From a paper:
Therefore, a high-resolution structure of the complex formed between the C-terminal truncation of gpJ, starting from residue 713 (referred to as gpJ713), and ssLamB in a detergent environment was determined. The structure elucidated the interaction between LamB and the lambda tail in further detail. RBD inserts four loops (L1-L4) into the extracellular lumen of LamB. The interaction surface is significant, with an area of 6195 Å2 buried, a PISA calculated energy of –4.9 kcal/mol, and further stabilized by 45 hydrogen bond interactions. Upon binding with LamB, the distance between the three protomers of RBDs on the bottom side increases from 1.8 nm to 3 nm. Correspondingly, the top of RBD narrows, with the top loops moving closer to the central axis.
Bacteriophage lambda’s tip protein, gpJ, plays a crucial role when attaching to the cell surface. The gpJ trimer not only seals the tail tip into a closed cone but also extends a central tail fiber, providing the means through which lambda phage directly interacts with its host.
Residue numbers in the entry:
A (entry chain J): 871 to 975
B (entry chain Z): 818 to 975
C (entry chain F): 713 to 922
Amino acid sequence: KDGKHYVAGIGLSMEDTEEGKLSQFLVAANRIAFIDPANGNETPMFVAQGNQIFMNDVFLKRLTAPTITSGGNPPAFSLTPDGKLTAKNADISGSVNANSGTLSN
Amino acid sequence: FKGKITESHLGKELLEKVELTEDNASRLEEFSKEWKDASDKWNAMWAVKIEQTKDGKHYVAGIGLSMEDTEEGKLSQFLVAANRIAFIDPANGNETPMFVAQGNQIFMNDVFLKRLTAPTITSGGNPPAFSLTPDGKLTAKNADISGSVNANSGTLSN
Amino acid sequence: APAAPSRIELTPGYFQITATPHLAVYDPTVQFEFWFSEKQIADIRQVETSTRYLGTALYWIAASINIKPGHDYYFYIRSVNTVGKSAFVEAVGRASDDAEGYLDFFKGKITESHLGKELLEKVELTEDNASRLEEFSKEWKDASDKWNAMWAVKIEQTKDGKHYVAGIGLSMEDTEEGKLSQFLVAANRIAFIDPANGNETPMFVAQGNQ
């Protein structure tokens, strides 16, 4: 288009390195979407586009994220790489072991 | 994204098509077509759409990669319409999947991230050990903080 | 008249809920009628009309794709005998949440499938330094007069007497409810890249269960 190129494609390959044969599945596309058509469903449940991934409810074993946000401007809760935890309320059924505290009441 | 996929070429190609109508009729299909649209520009798509009919109802599954022409430029789209998308690492003959997507749910093993934006986070369980809700609530069993706790109010037993 | 059960235990499981009752007074001559529901009904007299009839036994297990993890489902349990039915009692149950357990269940389900034994568990090629690509799309009828379809590209190689296999497959097979689709990718590195503006940095890399 107007002198600029656009290339997309999928590919499964098995190549060789000093260790042995390594397999690799690759998808180069601007938007990768997964859709479950059960009972005629059309809402995607995994859409990756522009270095961003949008997913529905997800089940996990271990997460390693240095930044976690609740969304919104003035987010509701947030954890940041400096160890900061920002929240609006907190119930703790046991003990709060802090090195310092500043409370109004 | 559902709307954008519906307003695409594969949305009415891999889906919205009702080929075959009688019971026990199954078609295996795979095409590779590039053609010029009404906008005098080329759109291309390669797809494997396999469909079956049972009790008068249609089950269609498919893989499809296309690139079409938007107003600003060419957009490429890879789509997988299936009831269960699974990724498996076969190293040393492993069969346990590491990414299973089914029914608007994604199950994964440990994952590394740069930034997460989730309103609800749960530890899993009847009474979750820890939880974070969109109303700003942090529920936990113990809280060890190496610095300062700056709060408007506090209610401690001891 | 038989009394309502004192307690109901519900063992969770991967896409499944167990249900066994227990009475304060033991009586082996009574059975239990079990009904399942997804949404709570305020009225109790129309549970028999608005809930699925799970069955009648001393205990039951409801295992289906419809039951999802992280969701609360309702069970209506009653005690019946030669005298008559008893009062209906509510119970709340959820499936398991362990992603490791669900991935083990999914490994079992994939192994108990046609692509599981197609892209894996095949020992084609035996000599060293031998490789083959094989792309096939076949539809065939099973012994149960149902049709199963599949399309798979499989790469296999041999080195120093060991087999390295990778594959990409899309299939729809027959299960006890009808037909179910599946898309399997077996490879040592699964990468998603956005090539806009000459970008090569992947935005999703799956490898080594990470």
